[PDB]
Design an enzyme around this catalytic site. Structure first.
Site, PDB file in Angstrom:
ATOM      1  N   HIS A  95      44.420  -6.915  63.020  1.00  0.00           N
ATOM      2  CA  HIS A  95      43.695  -6.787  61.733  1.00  0.00           C
ATOM      3  C   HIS A  95      42.960  -5.432  61.541  1.00  0.00           C
ATOM      4  CE1 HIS A  95      41.429  -8.620  58.231  1.00  0.00           C
ATOM      5  NE2 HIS A  95      40.507  -7.724  58.558  1.00  0.00           N
ATOM      6  N   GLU A  96      42.244  -4.987  62.562  1.00  0.00           N
ATOM      7  CA  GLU A  96      41.536  -3.715  62.471  1.00  0.00           C
ATOM      8  C   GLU A  96      42.552  -2.577  62.523  1.00  0.00           C
ATOM      9  OE1 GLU A  96      38.751  -3.919  61.542  1.00  0.00           O
ATOM     10  OE2 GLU A  96      38.419  -6.060  61.976  1.00  0.00           O
TER      11      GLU A  96
ATOM     12  N   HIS B  57      43.794  -2.026  59.291  1.00  0.00           N
ATOM     13  CA  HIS B  57      42.912  -1.225  58.436  1.00  0.00           C
ATOM     14  C   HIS B  57      43.122   0.313  58.619  1.00  0.00           C
ATOM     15  CE1 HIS B  57      40.696  -4.267  56.361  1.00  0.00           C
ATOM     16  NE2 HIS B  57      39.984  -4.712  57.385  1.00  0.00           N
TER      17      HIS B  57
ATOM     18  N   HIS C  11      42.306  -6.109  52.458  1.00  0.00           N
ATOM     19  CA  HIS C  11      42.349  -7.535  52.673  1.00  0.00           C
ATOM     20  C   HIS C  11      43.215  -8.158  51.603  1.00  0.00           C
ATOM     21  CE1 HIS C  11      38.291  -7.397  54.949  1.00  0.00           C
ATOM     22  NE2 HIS C  11      39.309  -7.107  55.748  1.00  0.00           N
TER      23      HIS C  11
HETATM   24 ZN   LIG Z   1      39.128  -6.596  57.549  1.00  0.00          ZN
END
Ligand SMILES: [Zn+2]
Length: 197
Positions: free
Chosen positions: A141-142, A145, A151
């Protein structure tokens, strides 16, 4: 989701996570390797290979002041990666793995669209779960990013995909169609060179 790419990821274990596993490097290494193996499966659809450049552990003391305020810590960590880590180990991105409980709802944090950047290619991860799929999804998830992903908004047709805003206990190992687009946009608009080799 098409150019064959590669991320040499470096993991940094802080002193609090070191002490949490009873100061044992092998437990930590194997724990981290299982989670990273799961990350690889998550990313093969994007045609992106993840390689571990190494795992450093702050066995004696923390090299930075690890604060519960995620924001400060991410900035402290990225700076330390620029001025220290990168001189010793070459890596496209580093991810701090800590046992500190960040203030509020947060369990991880990264800079958006900074993959390969000497100052900003970093992420923060709280060892908040014993379930490796949950941790692997947090890590993925990071990293998502840093690779330009936002998101998943309700209008993304997925609530359990990797980029869902809050962690789901039974997550999919998939990237929504919004995440694929953000990624194509990052590739074409940002032109990260380090990942194409
Ligand atoms: Zn996030």
């Amino acid at each position: 989701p098409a150019p064959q790419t590669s991320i040499e990821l470096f993991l940094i274990v802080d002193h609090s996570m070191y002490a949490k596993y009873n100061s044992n490097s092998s437990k930590i290494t194997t724990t981290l390797k299982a989670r990273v193996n799961i990350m690889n499966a998550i990313y093969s659809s994007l045609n992106l290979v993840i390689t571990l450049s190494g795992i450093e552990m702050w066995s004696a003391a923390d090299l930075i002041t690890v604060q519960s305020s995620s924001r400060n810590t991410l900035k402290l960590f990225a700076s330390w990666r620029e001025t220290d880590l990168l001189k010793r180990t070459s890596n496209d991105n580093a991810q701090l793995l800590t046992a500190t409980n960040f203030n509020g709802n947060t369990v991880g944090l990264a800079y958006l669209k900074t993959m390969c950047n000497s100052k900003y290619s970093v992420g923060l991860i709280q060892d908040h779960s014993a379930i490796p799929l949950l941790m692997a999804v947090t890590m993925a998830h990071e990293l998502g990013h840093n690779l330009g992903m936002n998101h998943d908004g309700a209008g993304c047709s997925c609530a359990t995909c990797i980029m869902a805003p809050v962690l789901s206990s039974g997550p999919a190992k998939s990237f929504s169609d919004c995440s694929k687009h953000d990624y194509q946009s990052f590739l074409t608009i940002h032109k990260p060179q380090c990942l194409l080799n």
